[PDB]
Amino acid sequence: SQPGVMYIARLPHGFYEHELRGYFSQFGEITRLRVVRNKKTGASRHRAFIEFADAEVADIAARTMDKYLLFGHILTCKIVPPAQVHPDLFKGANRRFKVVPWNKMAGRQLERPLSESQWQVKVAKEEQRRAARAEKLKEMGYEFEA
Template sequence: MNIYVSNLSFAVQDEDLRGFFEEYGEVSSAKVIMDKFTNRSRGFGFVEMPSNESAQKAIKELDGATVDGRAIRVNEAKPREDRPKKSFSNSGSNRW
């Protein structure tokens, strides 16, 4: 199961995130999302756990837990929706 974790301290790294969840079962991956321009944490991440039972227990027990002085939010990740492609053409728009 893919788990979304938000309101993370900017000091939390991948290994820390993995450690929070390993107490509840096997963790396939743990990734804090980084800003591509500043290379700083964006304050959220994703954890993948192969056992749905372990993942549900982790979600239940970690949602609202205080980590580094912040109450984290933990939910099952929703599938990413397709975003419309941005068009950089000037068709139909004469702004000059």
């Protein structure tokens, strides 16, 4: 009665979570599903972990869908035994994975008006950083001043 964890990889672009949940729900009962994505840009690593209610339906689905040429991707659906199953393996299951625009965030995080006291810290971090660079090009024989 224990749940069985199945590892599916070589995922085509388009076979993400809701389509992954939809197809394997035709086999049995899907409890928790989480694809492996990237926190920098939301994008699948072509690898997903699924877990069914029954161990019988986990072995049936993996054996019948193991090598299945889907959109140029010969899949790899294997059964992770309950011996391994890492405890923090579904930390974000059944949750949207939002696409956070960090470069737009950090790009205009620089642009906002800043505190005058912080602008003193800006100068201090500047002059420390210019001074060490003057050191590291003096063995290159270079002096530049500003």
